């Protein structure tokens, strides 16, 4: 036809996703997400909607041969340049904001759903594909990456939009870090990890129903994030923590974050 499959990128939440050639015009790799039923620079564009049976659709999406991870995992020992971070970060938010309004919630902001062009333009994506981390040290055990899942969600309380903001802070952190910030193996374990840094929120910030109540956890500190997100600046520290805030109502908005003095 006007596209040529070349591989199953993988299989996940959304069926299998493939890499194809956009010979339709020429060259360019593209992604195919098969779907049965019965504009922004920083967001992957839907290119086409092939009807595979009169319904089966085949969405053809923009695609990039680099994600936030391979890039970070690639950069020179000193690290991503300050402004580079600030930049990706701005776009990451910019497209984020765009998603939110138009009432869309990403819900899966891992760095693998974050594409970065050779140019450096950031375009969010959503393959619904998993990645399974095996663990370091003796009592090894697998974990799929939820290291970017908000408290609200680990707690199974809220699943509101701020959900995405938690995820961005986690990423922001990882741009200075070049290693995921909070990396546990269980929902409760993950909660642990978040808390050792951000500290036991106040009883008034934790929700009722929840299977994991505040009492389940220790108070232990509220460590200065900077001994983790090494080298962030003060204005960033502010934005970072404005994302990384346990209580979702009291968590910065994308729209707002965007207007933050880090991007002065």
């Amino acid at each position: 036809q006007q596209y040529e499959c070349v591989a199953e990128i993988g299989e996940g939440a959304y069926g299998k996703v493939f890499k194809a050639r956009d010979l339709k015009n020429g060259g360019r790799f593209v992604a195919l997400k098969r779907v049965r039923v019965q504009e922004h620079p920083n967001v992957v564009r839907l290119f086409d909607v092939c009807t595979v049976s009169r319904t089966k659709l085949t969405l053809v999406f923009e695609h990039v041969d680099q994600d936030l991870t391979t890039y970070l995992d690639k950069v020179p020992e000193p690290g991503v340049p300050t402004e580079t971070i600030k930049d990706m970060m701005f776009q990451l938010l910019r497209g984020l904001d765009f998603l939110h309004s138009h009432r869309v919630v990403h819900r899966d902001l891992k760095p693998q759903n974050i594409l970065v062009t050779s140019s450096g333009q950031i375009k969010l994506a959503d393959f619904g594909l998993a990645r399974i981390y095996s663990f370091q040290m003796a009592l090894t055990s697998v974990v799929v990456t939820l290291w970017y899942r908000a408290p609200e969600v680990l707690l199974q309380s809220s699943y509101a939009t701020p959900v995405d903001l938690w995820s961005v802070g986690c990423i922001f952190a990882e741009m200075f870090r070049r290693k995921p910030l909070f990396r546990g193996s269980s929902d409760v374990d993950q909660l642990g990890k978040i808390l050792d840094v951000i500290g036991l929120p106040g009883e008034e910030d934790w929700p009722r129903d929840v299977a994991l109540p505040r009492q389940a956890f220790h108070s232990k500190s509220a460590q200065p994030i900077e001994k983790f997100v090494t080298d962030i600046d003060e204005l960033g520290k502010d934005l970072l923590l404005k994302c990384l805030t346990f209580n979702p109502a009291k968590r910065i908005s994308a729209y707002s974050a965007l207007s933050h003095p880090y991007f002065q």
Partner: protein, 155 residues
């Protein structure tokens, strides 16, 4: 083909670990075709130099082409990952291999505007090859208005 798919998908996703696993602690032939008959080096996450490298170190025919006669170097160059473009080259990839439409690596770079690639390639590329539109790198660099490029090319 199974492993063709297991290794390609890994490559594609930029999962280094798997690629290194399926290669070593699994022993998949780098060139193993997927159910679409493409090898992994072909479909890999072009920005993942490490994957490119890993594959090329276990063999992996750097010189291979698409239905549309395209190949690792066209992709790399078109995508801008020079880091990888080098790797490919440093491992014998041929830069002067034309794609189905006649465009060669450097045509793509110019087309896309990847200055440093164009820079990297120009040297070793036949700047006389004609595009499907009959253009040479320079003529297209011009057709586009890629000053910086035109300049590299001039030499």
């Amino acid at each position: 083909v199974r492993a063709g798919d297991r290794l390609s998908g890994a490559a594609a996703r930029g999962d280094v670990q798997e690629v290194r696993r399926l290669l070593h602690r699994e022993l998949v032939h780098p060139d193993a075709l997927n159910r679409f008959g493409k090898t992994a080096l072909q479909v890999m996450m072009f920005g993942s130099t490490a994957i490119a490298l890993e594959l090329l170190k276990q063999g992996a025919s750097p010189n291979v082409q698409d239905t549309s006669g395209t190949s690792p170097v066209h992709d790399a160059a078109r995508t801008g990952f020079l880091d990888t473009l080098k790797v490919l080259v440093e491992h014998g990839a041929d830069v002067n291999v034309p794609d189905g439409t006649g465009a060669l690596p450097i045509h793509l770079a110019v087309q896309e505007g990847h200055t440093a690639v164009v820079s990297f390639l120009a040297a070793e590329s036949d700047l006389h090859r004609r595009d499907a539109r009959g253009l040479t790198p320079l003529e297209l660099a011009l057709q586009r208005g890629a000053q910086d490029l035109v300049d590299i090319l001039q030499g």
